Design a protein around this ligand. Structure first.
Ligand SMILES: NS(=O)(=O)c1cc(C(=O)O)c(Cl)cc1Cl
Ligand code: NI
Ligand SMILES: [Zn+2]
Length: 263
């Protein structure tokens, strides 16, 4: 009988279309992202507003991991947490990262009534009742991701401290100290959201994520998102391959219901 055990990426040869070969959970019923069909999405008056408590958030480092860039946080205490919305309990912010396109007309992972945004911001949190992120990763209610759409318009002031250091992490494996960054400067004004049970959108595509996708996009300038597109998927000394189109497309919703926090 069959038995199951090159690196994944976003290229023709190793992109989303192929991930199912090493990560067969891609074939399952809880995969992210999804298209949010607003007609289908049922307003659920029993969802609470999302309580974002980032008042003490302690950023640590910023790094290029070869598939995105991310800002890490001290998650040893409840410095930056999510609760309420659809969540039971407290989730601690570990990291945020982005996905974006080669052009403004694509780049988001989630879509809304089939519309793609220019980019999507993901704030990754883990359920404190499991003690750390490695234990949480193993559970169905282990993680919560707050997803935020980016459109191109006016500059996002809170994003500028990030953009101003991207030249220091151009290539894979580069990182830098990145202290005193306030993630509140990346939120939109309204915290109205859609929620559904899903997965990581990157391998290993584990099905343990409560997704919270905000209705309202933030706007960033063309100049800012152009700075994203100057990152490299490659290492220093390797041929240049610009880090663009690092998004997985919408996956089948199957039997899941997406709920809205708003009428
Ligand atoms: N795209 S995602 O589903 O938010 C996600 C991405 C990553 C990643 O760094 O590749 C991680 Cl560790 C966790 C999550 Cl939850
Ligand atoms: Ni066997
Ligand atoms: Zn992500």
């Amino acid at each position: 009988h069959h038995h199951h055990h090159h690196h994944w990426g976003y290229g023709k040869h190793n992109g989303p279309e192929h991930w199912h070969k090493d990560f067969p959970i891609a074939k399952g019923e809880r995969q992210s992202p999804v298209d949010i069909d607003t007609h289908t999405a049922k307003y659920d008056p029993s969802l609470k507003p999302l309580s974002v408590s980032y008042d003490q958030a302690t950023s640590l480092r910023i790094l290029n991991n070869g598939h995105s860039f991310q800002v890490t946080f001290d998650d040893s205490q409840d410095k930056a947490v999510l609760k309420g919305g659809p969540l039971d309990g407290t989730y601690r912010l570990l990291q945020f990262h982005f996905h974006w396109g080669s052009l403004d007309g694509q780049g988001s992972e989630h879509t809304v009534d089939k519309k793609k945004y220019a980019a999507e911001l993901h704030l990754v949190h883990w359920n404190t009742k499991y003690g750390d992120v490695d234990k949480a990763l193993q559970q169905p209610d282990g993680l919560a991701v707050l997803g935020i759409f980016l459109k191109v318009g006016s500059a996002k002031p809170g994003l500028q401290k990030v953009v101003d250091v991207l030249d220091s992490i151009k290539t894979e494996g580069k990182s830098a100290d990145f202290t005193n960054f306030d993630p509140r400067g990346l939120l939109p004004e309204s915290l109205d959201y859609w929620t559904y049970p899903g997965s990581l959108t990157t391998p290993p595509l584990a099905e343990g994520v409560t997704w919270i996708v905000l209705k309202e996009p933030i706007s960033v300038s063309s100049e800012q998102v152009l700075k994203f597109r100057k990152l490299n998927f490659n290492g220093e000394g390797e041929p240049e391959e610009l880090m663009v189109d690092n998004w997985r497309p919408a996956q089948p919703l199957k039997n899941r219901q997406i709920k809205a926090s708003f009428k």
